[PDB]
Amino acid sequence: ILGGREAEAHARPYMASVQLNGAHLCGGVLVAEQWVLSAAHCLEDAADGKVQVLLGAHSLSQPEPSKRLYDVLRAVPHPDSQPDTIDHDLLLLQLSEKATLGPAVRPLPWQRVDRDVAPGTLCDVAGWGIVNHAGRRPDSLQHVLLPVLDRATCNRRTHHDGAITERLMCAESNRRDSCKGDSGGPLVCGGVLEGVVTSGSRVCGNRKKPGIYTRVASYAAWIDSVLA
């Protein structure tokens, strides 16, 4: 997260760190007792690496009573996701058992009504991604509040030049932004999950290249099918 602040520890009990061989790789969001949603590109060339999900965390490194590292029974990328596109960039991770719930670990309600978030709506995105251009990695969860950017602006040639489909949304990226390592994490608006940070390499903090988020409401039936 660029231009953000250290999050209040455990105030986002849905927040997941998706880890590969013990290192933070991507954000994710607990959406059911046994299921974490993230981005499909996260597991590109993950091969047979050990994929785990850390729940209940603030610090990646320090002991906390609510922190638990879960193994993953199933990783389910969206069938239409592809390495060279930003489309359908969702991943569902089935934990090896249902998560132990409490004040620091709780699924987030998620949007099923397929209607756009209004431009200017202030939404929260959190993550353990890089916090500066040097690539400094924070030990603890960071967050930033970002206004939703209208799709027409986001689609201007100067911005993302027609790439933003009805299944995607954008947020402003003027100094405050998601960045490398924040992919897969949640964009939350009014206490409901609306977006998942896409996992394509994108310059961070430049107003001319807004953040892109997959609209969870557009994939409601897919999320349901995988859980079933």
Ligand SMILES: Cn1cc(NC(=O)N2CCC[C@H]2C(=O)Nc2cccc(OC(F)(F)F)c2)c2ccccc21
């Ligand atoms: C906006 N933005 C999104 C990008 N993509 C992206 O993050 N990923 C693609 C799928 C995997 C994930 C990733 O690279 N994770 C990763 C890798 C190494 C360390 C690490 O820990 C960390 F963050 F440094 F603390 C995290 C991305 C990449 C570059 C620039 C902007 C970028």
